[PDB]
Amino acid sequence: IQVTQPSVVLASSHGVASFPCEYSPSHNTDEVRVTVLRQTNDQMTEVCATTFTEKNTVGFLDYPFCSGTFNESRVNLTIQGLRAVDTGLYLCKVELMYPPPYFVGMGNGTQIYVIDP
Amino acid sequence: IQVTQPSVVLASSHGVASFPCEYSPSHNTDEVRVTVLRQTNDQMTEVCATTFTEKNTVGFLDYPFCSGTFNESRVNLTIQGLRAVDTGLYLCKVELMYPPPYFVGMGNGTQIYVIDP
Ligand SMILES: [Cl-]
Ligand SMILES: [Cl-]
């Protein structure tokens, strides 16, 4: 099992940071639960999360500041409304809900830099 | 009218580059045609393009190497299959097809750096 994400992402002047979160192993029938966590001193804060049961579908509908899409082995994440205080480490967590066997994995985190707009 | 896009995007190690393309003014009923152009010496090459008629929908369905979603005032773009040689300046073009009046705008380009380790 393995989840990976980019090391660094430079947010847009308007505070948008988009990047992929990839995982293995993957299958044609994958359905996943994706969770974005910000890591600080010893602890993590959940930023947003969503479930994807099919491709070509926009997720995180109930989170104004997160959006994303999904296809086998990859979740395209978008984090919005970022401010200077928000630069830091953001972990991507992926849970394979179907097909069995079940498994959970987490990336090493993407350093998001919100550079002086 | 105005279209803006990030200045720099560091492509993922798997050749994935995602970034927003924002326009103004916007409207709840907006329907747009989005075009991605790669700019080289004096000329431009059309990479991919798609039409969005409703929010929360995934576009560029007919392009294996492009994807994206749309919401009022913002198109979230994703270009994949990128190689080191594809490093370059990518312009985002937006045509507001509805509601009237018709308008077309283009950003100053996003410089996408690709290093496929
Ligand atoms: Cl990278
Ligand atoms: Cl990216």
Domain boundaries, chain B: 1-117
Q: Which amino acid is at A52?
A: F
| CB contact at 8 A, B91 and B39 | yes
Asked whether the beta carbons of residue A78 and residue B13 sit closer than 8 angstroms, the reply is no
| Experimental method of this PDB entry | X-ray
B68, burial (CB in 10 Å: exposed 0-12, middle 13-18, buried 19+):
buried
| CB contact at 8 A, A92 and A21 | yes
Closest CA to A78 of B43, B70, B112, B83: B70
| CB contact at 8 A, A55 and A70 | yes
Q: How many CB pairs under 8 A join A and B?
A: 60
Provide the strand spans (E) within chain B. Answer: 2-4, 8-10, 17-24, 31-39, 44-52, 58-59, 66-71, 74-79, 88-98, 103-106, 110-113
Ligand nearest to the CA of A10: 2
Beta strand B17-24 with B74-79 is antiparallel
Kindly state the tokens that stand for B75.
């198109």
Nearest chain A residue to B7 by CA distance is A12
**Which contiguous run of DSSP H or E holds residue A68?**
strand A66-71
Q: Quickly tell me which residue has 């990336």 as its tokens.
A: A107
Nearest chain B residue to A117 by CA distance is B6
Nearest chain B residue to A55 by CA distance is B58
- How many alpha carbons lie under 13 Å from residue A74 in its C-beta half-sphere? 16
Distance (Å) from CA A108 to ligand 2 centroid: 16
| CB contact at 8 A, B60 and B50 | yes
Distance, first Cα to last Cα, chain A? 38
Asked whether the beta carbons of residue A6 and residue B22 sit closer than 8 angstroms, the reply is no
Asked whether the beta carbons of residue B22 and residue A10 sit closer than 8 angstroms, the reply is no
Distance (Å) from CA B110 to ligand 2 centroid: 11
Whole-number Å distance between alpha carbons of B53 and B91: 21
Name the CA dihedral angle for A44, A49, A54, A57, rounded to a multiple of 10 degrees.
Answer: -120
Distance (Å) from CA B100 to ligand 2 centroid: 33
Resolution (angstroms) stands at: 2.0
Contacts of A18 in chain B (CB under 8 A): 18-20, 76, 78
Distance (Å) from CA B69 to ligand 2 centroid: 15
Superfamily of domain B1-117: Immunoglobulins (2.60.40.10)
Nearest chain A residue to B9 by CA distance is A10
Asked whether the beta carbons of residue B57 and residue A61 sit closer than 8 angstroms, the reply is no
